[model samples]
Target chain A: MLYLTQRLEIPAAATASVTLPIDVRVKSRVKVTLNDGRDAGLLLPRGLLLRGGDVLSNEEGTEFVQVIAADEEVSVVRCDDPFMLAKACYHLGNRHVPLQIMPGELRYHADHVLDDMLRQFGLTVTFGQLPFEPEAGA
Target chain B: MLYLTQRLEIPAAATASVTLPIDVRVKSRVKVTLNDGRDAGLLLPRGLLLRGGDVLSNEEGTEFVQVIAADEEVSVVRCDDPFMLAKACYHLGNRHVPLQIMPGELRYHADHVLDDMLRQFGLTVTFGQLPFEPEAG
Candidate 1:
């Protein structure tokens, strides 16, 4: 079991990569499998969303793993209208929904209630799979 | 007292307007005085915020009032860095703080805790008065 404790923001070259869904990435303590099928343990400092391309390393530098956002169940809303996008953002933000905001789309954890809420605004909420990397907060 | 019951999304040419601060605009029930010095009553629906430029008219169509955002106490943060701005927005939004997002600035109700939090990010939180028209959520 590799003890991954350090957040390598300016990461050195890593030997292996781990593809974690956003749900598991938000967790501080968990058992995970690396892309190479190696078993690893994540015991890092709490309170951060490990975004894609983020890095973590073992304390002794024996192991370094890059974090990759993997495909997860998500609800997506696409629109070219800026006003509509802002409205969607405002409503989602009002509910404190964790979201990945793109230039013309927004994605969140698949939620029926949230899906219906956006539909009220005439938005098309599509249940699709995508990498969920919400904005990280300290 | 004028009972302003209907929202005039396409406001007609109004003879008067009411200047309301963001705080009062969020409330469903209120007594306000129009800019023309005429008193009016707002009986708007409970769910929606009365955004600046929204109109309210009496059922009889005799009175029409345009809502104007009044200058109110606010904390403003200006930064040319989009990442910093987005971080600021995420933190604020996480707390469900009402915010007005501009190209290079963000404004919210004057708040000490929120101000101090942003200061930790090396942001300048300026206390000033501005027409607070936070995105009508």
Candidate 2:
């Protein structure tokens, strides 16, 4: 059983890769299978969100793995005004739905009711496919 | 035993009043009491939010009652940049905290861990009193 014991928060050359979305990346303890179908166990610090490009290895450091954010359907909203974007963020946040924050846009995992709410709230909501990376909460 | 069966979305002249926060105001059915020490049953729409100045009444509409937002403590963060404010709103929202939104500020009911998180994230967080009027999620 491959058990990940050390994580280089900084850097590279992963022999293998694991693609996961925020919903699964946010877990610190998990049982994962690499692309090669090799079973592995994750034991990172509690409550850690494994970002794409993060390097993980075992105690000996002989083997290194890369974390990749898998692409998923997401709801999006864009505006020239960041304040308007901010106002949109407020309602989403109020609904306890945290979208990935950007300079003039926002993204979240697709949801029917939520997208409808934003559309009705005057935002021109869009749909797209992208790697899901959400904010780290307190 | 007064049961509220009607609500005037626009206006009213309340015979009595009740004060409650959004935490309590969002309930569709509730047992409430007036400042006059009278009990009134609330049976509004299934998912109604009683605003601070909302008026409630019975079938006769003769006894209109008012709803008031009471005071509470909330952690405050202010900035000139709405972008920065918006970024901060991300973390709070991710944690399921719905704060009241405004021009360049954010407010949430006071919480020790959440405040520390924002403070550590480089936001100048403060504490103060106000009638908590959190955004309807």
Candidate 3:
């Protein structure tokens, strides 16, 4: 597996497509395969959150890899009211759950227990195949 | 007012004591004074969220600045159930609220409008003086 350790200073002229959810992206060490069928290992600094479009390169800078938010099963909660949305964030942050905040949608890794709790809050909850891009923790 | 552009790659060795609430930290730009009485400008990358303990330095790298969670007036939400916490996060993210997530507590900038909404959800909402460290979004 090719070990990727440092972020390239320049934009990646190449790409490494990833389908792993946000939960997996936070890890400093992970094994993945490039889009070209090349096996690689990610060895980045701990706490560096890899978001979609983040670029990585090897020491030699010969290969450039780009991150792609992968498709996975997730639970998404969306609302039109900014007030309701703020309240929901307050509660979820209390739980310390990894969350992906988007323009109008909130996403988290699939968990039946959490799903039921959101339903009780009168939220419109839906589960389907989608990409999860969680916030990179501080 | 000063503008700080570009993030220095070195670690901060000096400390700037601050007590601002979480709401202020997420701002893309702000004017602040160091505890040592140095007037400074925080002109960082727009999406580079600042968390407590983050280090900043000047162009010469001679002065290092450290961030401290300031004691301030803020709102906190607490609960025992992880599921409930998860639910709250979903909704808050939808609204684009910057939140500080902890093991059993959630914190954000104090806003009367947002506070009322939390109380309606049966949460234990309290306002007090404490160090506000919202998530570094």
Candidate 4:
């Protein structure tokens, strides 16, 4: 697999594409397939949150790749009250689990361990297909 | 003192401006002064993390304002190992404390209470004038 370890600045007109879900986006290295079906490996910095519009370029800058948000299957927990949502987030955060927070929902990459913990809080858990965009640390 | 209580959908052509430190950006309501020297209120959704490019508009969508990231005072904690960082995040996350996560660092609103907890984990804490853009949750 081709390894992409660094982020390169692209010219305004350069174009290419890669689609990744939140789970894959946070990794320091991973095998990925470009939108055009080209196989590549991501060897970028760890913990960097890749957003939809972020662009990645090779060392030569000849090929500019766009980051697209990919949808995936995930477990979602919903809370209507702000305090309840806060409580859920607190528990999830404590576990150091990466979660995608939405207006009234919280999602993680679906682990039975975490799923049981969330249910213990009296929150409803459901399965769904959605894009995961976690908080970019301050 | 003025407080902003709601988020106006950003319009395509609206334009105005305000710059706020990361700490203030995460706040749902705040007393502020616009760049134009007008006192303003921010009434946004609670727990919504505001970004540098987010725009706020009025009811009619005529008056538009932009949110800018500002420099402010903050506390940061650094952890070298990914597992250690994850552990630290897990502990802080349990407290429901808002934090900013970087590659090997974590930042919060600077509380002495939380500062001490981090120390027990052998993490180093530093203080500085860094922008505080914590997780929206």
- Measured against the native two-chain assembly using Cα atoms, what DockQ does each of the candidate structures obtain, in the order listed? 0.25, 0.34, 0.08, 0.15
Summarize candidate 1's per-residue lDDT along A31-132 as a digit string, tens digits: 856784678887877677688888888779876788988998999988765455656676676677888876667888999999998888788999998898
When 3 and 4 are scored with lDDT, the better candidate is 4
Off by over 4 Å in 3: B1-137
Q: Is the docking of candidate 1 incorrect, acceptable, medium or high quality?
A: acceptable
lDDT of 2 by residue, A1-138 (tens): 777767897576666778887887767868867774677888888767687888888888777888888898999888777656777776776666757877777899899788888777677788899887776653
Scored against the true structure, residue B122 in model 4 reaches a CA lDDT of: 79
Native contacts retained, all candidates in order: 0.11, 0.54, 0.17, 0.37
Model 3: per-residue Cα lDDT at residue A68: 69
Q: Candidate 1 regions off by >4 Å?
A: A1-13, A45-51, A54-60, A76-87, A102-105, A112-128, B1-17, B26-29, B34-66, B76-87, B101-105, B112-128
- Across A28-88, the per-residue lDDT of candidate 4 in tens digits comes to 5777568856777776875676787777765665566777788777788776644455556
lDDT score at residue B3, model 2, on the 0-100 scale: 86
Per-residue lDDT of candidate 3, residues A77-113 (tens digit): 8876544454556566657777776655788778888
Question: What are the runs in model 2 whose C-alpha is more than 4 Å off?
Answer: A1-75, A82-84, A87-98, A109-114, A127-133, A136-138, B28-31, B36-39, B43-47
Candidate 4's C-alpha runs over 4 A off are A1-14, A27-31, A136-138, B1-91, B94-137
**Interface RMSD list for the candidates:** 3.6, 2.4, 10.8, 9.3
For each candidate, the alpha-carbon lDDT, in order, equals 0.79, 0.79, 0.68, 0.70
- Clashing pairs for model 1 are none
